[PDB]
From a paper:
In a previous study, we showed that the [name]([name]) variant has almost no [name] activity, thus concluding that Asp30 is a key residue for its activity. Inspired by this result, we measured the EPR spectrum of the nitrite complex with [name]([name]). Interestingly, it shows a significantly increased ratio of HALS species (≈60%) compared to that of the wt [name][NO2–]. It shows that nitrite binds to the heme iron in an N-bound nitro form like in the cases of [name][NO2–] and [name](L130R)[NO2–]. The two mutations [name] and L130R, however, dramatically interfere with the distal heme pocket in the sense that the Asp30···water···water···nitrite H-bonding network of the wt protein is disrupted in both cases. In the cases of the nitrite complexes of [name](L130R) and [name]([name]), a negatively charged proximal histidinate—resulting from the perturbation of the H-bonding network in the distal heme pocket—would lead to a weakened Fe–Nnitrite coordination compared to that of the wt protein due to the trans effect or electron–electron (anion–anion) repulsion. In line with this are the slightly larger Fe–Nnitrite bond distances observed in the complexes of [name](L130R)[NO2–] (2.1 Å) and [name]([name])[NO2–] (2.1 Å) compared to that of [name][NO2–] (2.0 Å) (compare Fig. 3). Similarly, [name]([name]) was reported to have a lower redox potential than that of the wt [name] (–429 mV for [name]([name]) vs. –384 mV for wt [name] at pH 5.0),70 however, it cannot react with nitrite, which clearly argues for the role of the H-bonding network of NPs in determining the [name] activity.
Another heme b containing protein class with a novel type of nitrite reaction is the nitrophorins (NPs) that originate from the saliva of the blood feeding insect [name]. At least five isoforms appear concurrently in the insect saliva, termed NP1–4 and NP7.13,14 The biological function of the ferriheme b NPs has been established as an NO transporter. Interestingly, NPs were found to be able to convert nitrite into NO via a ‘nitrite-only’ mechanism with the stoichiometry of the nitrite disproportionation reaction. In summary, the key factors that facilitate the [name] reaction of NPs have been established to be the heme ruffling and an extended H-bonding network at the active site which helps to keep the proximal His residue neutral.
Author numbering: 1 to 184
Write the structure that this text describes.
Amino acid sequence: ACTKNAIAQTGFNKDKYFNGDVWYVTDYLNLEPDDVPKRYCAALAAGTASGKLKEALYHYDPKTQDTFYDVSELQVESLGKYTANFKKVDKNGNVKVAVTAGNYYTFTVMYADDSSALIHTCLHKGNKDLGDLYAVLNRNKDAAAGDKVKSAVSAATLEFSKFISTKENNCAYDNDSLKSLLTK
Ligand code: HEM
Ligand SMILES: O=N[O-]
């Protein structure tokens, strides 16, 4: 289960974050042991469509090849803090698993600037018992974490040395599909 009430960035700029562009996960920290594979890759696009906040997600396991996409409409809890019902889709936006109650994640943007972000997410999926996940994001694939986001990790009282890097995994990203999915 999740245990953290993540605090959103003071002065979070939603229009800049939800601009339709892609964010790559470069480093992550799951608070629950063995909750996720130690080698993994993920990216998301965040944008608006008809005034609705949307995210499209991409997960890729570089070992098993398990690959999936999701689309979510985000509902606002407060500035920088959202609740998202996800539907699993193929890369084209075709629905594979419909939205259902109890299938949702929370999403909190703890820090963001032009090129980087620190987020917290808590995933709820059926009767699975999942824990908190922090992720360092960058606009550039596999970019080393800069001083601003690393300082934000510290300011959140987290130890960046504990984060697991995705940068060394052989991962490819379909950034074009992520951007197109925002409308789906
Ligand atoms: C490298 C970072 C991440 C890792 C290692 C990771 C790991 C995983 C794993 C292992 C699953 C499968 C869970 C299951 O089916 O039992 C999963 C599903 C999921 N994750 Fe992540 N994740 C990451 C980043 C993210 C982010 C940033 C978000 C939200 C912004 C997210 C949202 C979701 C959602 C919505 C599902 C379920 C999708 C579906 O079943 O259709 N993940 N993740
Ligand atoms: O571990 N996916 O939120």
